[PDB]
């Protein structure tokens, strides 16, 4: 309306996961905060601990308001994601870098109308290696999934061929595309 802060296309929610051993996986999802302007985004990001400092078994998740960072959500069950793989040795030099860029593609609606298909993103820190992915609503939407992946790989700056794949959440639970 009057631009004292710059509005975002969507309100986003940042989630935290702690690899607990006495609750259902779904019960351990913990919400950090929600925001809907660019300035509020930066105040949260700048304050909370960076991804590279997450203890193994924990995650960060950024999803559109109302979509829980889990497969069962109605917006994720038929979807899937583009996955970026990182060995543990890249944690202090690449993880945060790739995470922030991922976050900027989301709040900035970087995939044109195809950003509507985006649900959120997740970064996983594991002793065996780390992961960063963007979740889309329909692994059946070829044109949207494809476009999302092209731009994303370009935004990350990944070499001509690191080759990143897209798998449906269903498979992961029990590549449909590459770029």
């Amino acid at each position: 309306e009057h631009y004292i802060k710059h509005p975002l296309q969507n309100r986003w929610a940042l989630w935290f996961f702690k690899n607990d051993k006495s609750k259902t996986w779904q019960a351990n999802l913990r919400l950090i905060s929600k925001f809907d302007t660019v300035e509020d985004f930066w105040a949260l990001y700048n304050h909370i601990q960076l991804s590279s400092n997450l203890m193994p078994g924990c995650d960060y998740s950024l999803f559109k308001d109302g979509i829980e960072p889990m497969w069962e959500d109605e917006k994720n069950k038929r979807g899937g994601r583009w996955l970026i793989t990182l060995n543990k040795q890249q944690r202090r030099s690449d993880l945060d870098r790739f995470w922030l860029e991922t976050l900027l593609c989301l709040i900035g609606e970087s995939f044109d109308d195809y950003s509507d298909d985006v649900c959120g993103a997740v970064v996983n820190v594991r002793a065996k290696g780390d992961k960063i992915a963007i979740w889309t609503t329909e692994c059946e939407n070829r044109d949207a999934v494809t476009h999302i992946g092209r731009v994303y790989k370009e935004r990350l700056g990944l070499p001509p061929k690191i080759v990143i794949g897209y798998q449906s959440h269903a498979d992961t639970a029990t590549n449909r595309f590459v770029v």
Partner: peptide
């Protein structure tokens, strides 16, 4: 639709 540039988003931290 509200779209923002990589550069503009970076400028908004100030």
């Amino acid at each position: 639709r509200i779209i923002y540039d990589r550069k503009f988003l970076m400028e908004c931290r100030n």
